[PDB]
Request: fold
Amino acid sequence: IDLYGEGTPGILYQETPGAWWYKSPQRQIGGDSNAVTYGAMKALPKIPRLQEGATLMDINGDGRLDWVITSAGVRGFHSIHSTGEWTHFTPLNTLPTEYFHPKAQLADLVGAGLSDLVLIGPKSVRLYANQQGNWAPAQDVTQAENVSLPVIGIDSRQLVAFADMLGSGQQHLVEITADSVKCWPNMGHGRFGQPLTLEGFSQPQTSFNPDRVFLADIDGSGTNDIIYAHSECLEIYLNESGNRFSKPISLLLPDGVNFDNTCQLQAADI
Amino acid sequence: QRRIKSVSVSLPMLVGPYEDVCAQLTQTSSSYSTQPNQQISLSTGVNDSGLFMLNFDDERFLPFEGSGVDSSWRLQFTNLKQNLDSLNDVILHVKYTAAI
Amino acid sequence: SLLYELNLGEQSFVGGGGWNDLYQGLMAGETLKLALMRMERVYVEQNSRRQEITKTISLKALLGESWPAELNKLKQKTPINFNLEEQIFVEDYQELYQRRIKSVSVSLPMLVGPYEDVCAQLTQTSSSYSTQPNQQISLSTGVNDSGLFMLNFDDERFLPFEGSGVDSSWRLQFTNLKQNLDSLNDVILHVKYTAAI
Amino acid sequence: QRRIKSVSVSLPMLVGPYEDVCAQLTQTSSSYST
Amino acid sequence: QRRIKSVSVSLPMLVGPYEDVCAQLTQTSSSYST
Amino acid sequence: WRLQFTNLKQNLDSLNDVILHVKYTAAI
Reply:
């Protein structure tokens, strides 16, 4: 993560209590003032860091991180400055929602930078509650019963995500098969619009394992673009204005390499 | 035929970090002709079941093991200081077994 | 063992004088057999399931205004003495007719060095209700410490404060002197206890 | 030779939060006289 | 001295959702008269 | 050792390589 607030993530390998070791992005010596590298790790004093629902989350929306405490009966965070100042522990006027499960945990639709959980699927909509790192009551709503129902967590050659194909900035619910894409308009509290299909995507249903897809916007517009793995090549699908999709770019992998279930693709601004 | 094997409860709620919600449930009576087992005291509320470590096949009978399905119940909080406006609703969970 | 494990007042089955010379103690074992049988009976009869309660507490919240002074004494690594008010327990569940401590654990809002093994220990001075080798636990994880390399229930041996009366007094102190302590915010206790009705 | 040891089922579906889908399966008959 | 206790295998591969790859391994012979 | 696939319909072009794992015990 970018714990330091570089505007660039650092590689904070961490293994055990204390193993917090930030391989950090550094300018290369020589050349244009563009060349950058991950320098060596560093150790810094840190929380016991375990059994706690560990994560370097900014819970408050500062742009600057806390670390989550959620052990059995044990609940709050610390805050960490760019200096690495792990502030003293913070009980939180604590009233987080009961964690039944992570399954279908919402984030965005409370409003940008205000993220909060909702656990949800068909015919109902729990309400988010986060303000500024505290929470309201987690109220109940539903949209109108005609509205098509988005629901996370089936592997059958299919995916669901909170990710903005549309590029408004709202990481809309989108559902993907081997063959089609549908996306639900943001409607705020407890509500969604009838979904829009986005034309153009497909893949052979014989072989479309869902996880071979990758989610990023590439064009820089905001419209989330699409990538799919062949063992030799990437198929890259670019979002037409948030409406449909271009002919896929086919990209040859590094020579002799083959992509496989070990491989982890990502995109980043290293 | 149907007989109750076990039960658990869940509360959509917000809880203080170290707040131990205090409440308990008890069975008044049960149908089918199916007290020490009839009462369970609860403080996690996430998926409470009144046992420090739940498991099947206890050499001793579980709180409502073998109870007739149709049955009546009483529920009440006990800590008075704890705020309750947080409460949305309660969801029960039941494991039961049946004949054919 | 049986009597402590069930606190059944005052009853007995074992008795001295079973040996005799004129009969070379021949029937003794048989008498022991019967006594054992009666104890077994009583155990099965009385070992009914019992209420189980999870309780937790901030030291700061407990100590109120004294808290910062005691925290200073802690920072200074001096031992802290304090007691447990059972009134809290009757507040949480007034209906229960008896309460005995089953087990305990501790948690420390703290920062720790990567491989820093915080060194501290806790001990019980005394306890109410008439309820040393079990009375002392040494702690170095601090996340959810309980003094055991692998905690589990139903140990064939008794746990550090198993069966202790709820109202009780305690002493706590750090032991490593080099370790920095300014990191410390507060301490939260955890207790598993069981109760009658 | 082949004999069945155990079975399980999976349904690509959406389910209400606390909706307990209710269905059942049964075997009518089997080859090899088991 | 060295004797085999157990074995396992791993395949860098892509698999269909419910594709049960089918293959098998066997030992022909071994040293040390085991 | 001998190794072979058995399902014939299954595509195999996906295959990169195979990695074995062995637990063994030894004297000194």
Q: What stands out?
A: Chains E and B do not touch (no CB pair under 8 Å). The two ends of chain E are 11 Å apart (CA to CA). Chain E has no helices and two strands.
